């Protein structure tokens, strides 16, 4: 058995579905059977958060959650606390976390100290991925995360229709964003670069600068090449209404 | 302090009250003219529980009498102790309900109830510390079972934290005096479970059985049934009006006898009861009282208590007696009958002692037990209801006054759900 589903109860929190994947490199992973068992069988619009971690973006996440609610979109992140959780819980949004099982901790009952890599309350579905040797690190789950996103957007094969729209939101609050951006560009997916992280602020600043004035101090050369090849959209706002308008636009229309 | 007001409705409730107040007045030494002529000091210390004070030194009950026809209250006034009731509290209509629940709850009972609610509000707002209300009415009549139950909801909506008592006579299929009894019984049980904090069922068939077998008197009349019901009614609040070893108000019984909020239908019984010719043979002892108290034929309901298991039980001893004997006898009555007591709640019998016995008796006991055997009454009531309703017999009388069959279906479903979930705990095991 390549995967096993569980009911996961967050301490003082919601009941989630937790799926352990025992081999992330398994050829032809049975996503159809997995998603049928989770009742995730419709095609859903997807908002994928790239490099999501704990950040001071509170009102921005309220706008993002509103746009996802109005579009019936599933949010996909890295299963750790981001500050989106209160808005997701209140609106009954589907929040899907994908993480390596070895890189995350299970929440402790009545713990006075939250670990920054603890699974956050608000996730409705958790995908904990492993290799055979249980040595998986951050970025190695990224291929599984994108394949899951593509299958969630396609839904059941019997629905003859185009897949639902997928938008990526580059937060870059963690340094491990590069592999996920590389895969998003490879699948021709739109990427919203959101203000608030040092990496995103540098990208936005350099997008407005003339070529001769561009200074890259934090962004790797590979990311600079990806910015020319991919569909990147700069959001120089932390306003809840501006992110909601961007997400709603990209979930409804493809501008390229 | 912690006093209660009396509200009665219908003919049956008025006849019950006409003896309950006589019994209370005789207990407190109040003459039918409202003048105290008692012997003991304790007879006056807690008289504020049931009686108000007026100028001239006379006492007046805080009772409210309501009916949709004036005959019964015009008759109770001419009876003994009929002058105690304040004339202002008499409220009545000019039409009547004709044993039709719809007329007494939707069309006629709705317009009249404002006047009686005015005097009810006057009585409750004034009193020192409210304990609660006690209600006497019959489920076999239209005006009673309608107006009383709607008044229950109206009172509960305004006093959600107070306690509410109801002494309800349900129509037995053995002695039937009205053909439309199942309809207004089933409709009333639906509303009664949602609002009453306590309910005590009483059956005329069980009263006749008791009178014929235990007292062995030749010709029972309504006066004897009323006297037994009145003694049982007085026994519950005795320790609230007199000192004792372990005082226990109504709220304490509510805490200890109701495990879940929807299981509050008790059946009661009074001991001792002996014939005139055998009153000299018997000797009053605690074992003699407790053996008659748990006797199946002594229950005020035809329900057979050895057809189910007690969830809990209560006893209110009266007179001066040793507590050690009471506790050991309660333990013995629970060890010898372990099969009829539910096992996942240990020590499910409550006891209380009051040092003031009834006038003329040296010892007395009032028994209030919550048992699973009460399901049989709702079963037969629902059986008759569904036998009569499937043909829509007598339905037009109810449907001509704004009521529909949907409220009948919901009432039947809720009553059946109550029956099922009441026995759910009978088969529950630890």
């Amino acid at each position: 058995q390549v995967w096993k589903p569980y009911d996961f109860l967050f301490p003082a929190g919601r009941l989630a579905k937790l799926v352990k994947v025992f081999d992330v490199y398994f050829k032809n992973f049975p996503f159809s059977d997995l998603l049928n068992k989770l009742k995730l069988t419709e095609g859903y619009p997807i908002v994928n958060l790239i490099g999501a971690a704990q950040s001071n973006r509170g009102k921005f996440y309220a706008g993002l959650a509103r746009a996802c609610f109005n579009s019936e979109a599933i949010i996909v992140d890295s299963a750790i606390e981001t500050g989106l959780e209160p808005y997701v819980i209140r609106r009954d949004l589907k929040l899907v976390g994908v993480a390596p099982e070895n890189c995350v901790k299970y929440p402790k009952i009545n713990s006075t100290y939250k670990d920054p890599y603890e699974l956050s309350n608000g996730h409705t579905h958790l995908f904990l991925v492993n290799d055979k040797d249980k040595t998986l690190q951050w970025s190695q789950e990224t291929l599984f995360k994108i394949q899951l996103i593509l299958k969630l957007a396609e839904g059941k094969v019997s629905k003859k229709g185009p897949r639902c729209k997928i938008v990526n939101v580059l937060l870059a609050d963690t340094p491990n964003y590069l592999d996920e951006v590389r895969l998003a560009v490879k699948y021709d997916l739109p990427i919203i670069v959101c203000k608030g992280s040092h990496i995103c602020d540098e990208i936005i600043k350099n997008s407005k600068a003339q070529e001769e004035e561009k200074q890259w101090n934090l962004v790797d050369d590979e990311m600079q090449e990806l910015l020319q090849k991919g569909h990147f959209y700069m959001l120089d706002s932390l306003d809840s209404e501006d992110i909601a308008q961007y997400i709603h636009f990209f979930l409804t229309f493809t501008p390229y | 302090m912690r006093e209660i007001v009396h509200i009665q409705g219908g003919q049956c409730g008025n006849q019950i009250g006409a003896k309950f107040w006589e019994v209370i007045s005789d207990e407190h030494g109040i003459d039918p003219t409202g003048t105290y002529h008692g012997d003991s000091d304790l007879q006056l210390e807690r008289i504020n529980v049931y009686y108000n004070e007026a100028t001239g030194g006379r006492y007046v009950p805080r009772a409210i009498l309501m009916d949709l026809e004036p005959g019964t209250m015009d008759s109770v006034r001419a009876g003994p102790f009929g002058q105690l009731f304040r004339p202002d509290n008499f409220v009545f209509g000019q039409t009547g309900a004709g044993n039709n629940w719809a007329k007494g709850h939707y069309t006629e009972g709705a317009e009249l109830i404002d006047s009686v609610l005015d005097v009810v509000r006057k009585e409750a707002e004034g009193c020192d510390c409210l304990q609660g209300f006690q209600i006497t009415h019959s489920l076999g009549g239209g005006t009673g079972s309608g107006m009383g139950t709607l008044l229950i909801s109206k009172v509960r909506e305004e006093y959600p934290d107070r306690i509410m008592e109801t002494f309800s006579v349900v129509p037995s299929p053995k002695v039937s005096d009205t053909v439309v009894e199942p309809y207004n019984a089933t409709l009333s049980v639906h509303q009664l479970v949602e609002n009453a904090d306590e309910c005590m069922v009483i059956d005329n068939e069980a009263l006749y059985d008791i009178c014929f077998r235990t007292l062995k008197l030749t010709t029972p009349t309504y006066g004897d049934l009323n006297h037994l019901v009145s003694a049982a009614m007085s026994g519950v609040t005795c320790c609230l009006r007199f000192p004792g070893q372990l005082n226990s108000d109504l709220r304490k019984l509510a805490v200890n006898l109701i495990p879940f909020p929807r299981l509050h239908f008790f059946m009661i019984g009074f001991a001792p009861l002996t014939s005139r010719g055998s009153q000299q043979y018997r000797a009053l002892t605690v074992p003699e009282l407790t053996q008659q108290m748990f006797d199946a034929k002594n229950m005020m309901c035809a329900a057979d208590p050895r057809h189910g298991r007690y969830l809990t039980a209560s006893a209110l001893f009266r007179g001066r007696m040793s507590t050690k004997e009471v506790d050991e006898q309660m333990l013995n009555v629970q060890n010898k009958n372990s099969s009829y007591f539910v096992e996942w709640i240990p020590n499910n019998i409550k006891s209380s002692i009051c040092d003031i016995p009834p006038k003329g008796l040296k010892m007395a006991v009032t028994f209030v037990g919550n048992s699973t055997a009460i399901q049989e009454m709702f079963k037969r009531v629902a059986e008759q209801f569904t036998a009569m309703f499937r043909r829509k017999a007598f339905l037009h009388w109810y449907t001509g006054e704004g009521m529909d069959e949907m409220e009948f279906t919901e009432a039947e479903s809720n009553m059946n759900d109550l029956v099922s979930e009441y026995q759910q705990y009978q088969d529950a095991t630890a």
């Binding site: 589903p5 569980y6 009911d7 996961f8 109860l9 967050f10 301490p11 003082a12 929190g13 009941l15 579905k17 937790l18 509170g58 009102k59 309220a62 706008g63 209160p86 209140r90 299970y106 929440p107 402790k108 009952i109 009545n110 713990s111 809840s240 | 509000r121 409750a124 707002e125 004034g126 009193c127 020192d128 510390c129 409210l130 305004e158 006093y159």
Partner: protein, 91 residues
Amino acid sequence: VSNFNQRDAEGVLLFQFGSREKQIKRENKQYIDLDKEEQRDKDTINILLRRYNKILKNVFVKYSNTGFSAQFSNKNVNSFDAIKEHNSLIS
């Protein structure tokens, strides 16, 4: 809740394949904190509460003294301040 001799661990982690779904459905048979809400919602609600404050205060005063409290029956209210405090509360 930690057990006997359990300083701490995790008290809510795993059940069999969403079995709790049937139990939660049987058992099932949120406060809006304006300080955590969007600033627009906080500001618009505060504007509306200011606009209708006179109505809300009339409604409050109309209902705050309509309940029968046996506690405040005229005899035992020894101080004007206790009456004032009661009249400033709604049940």
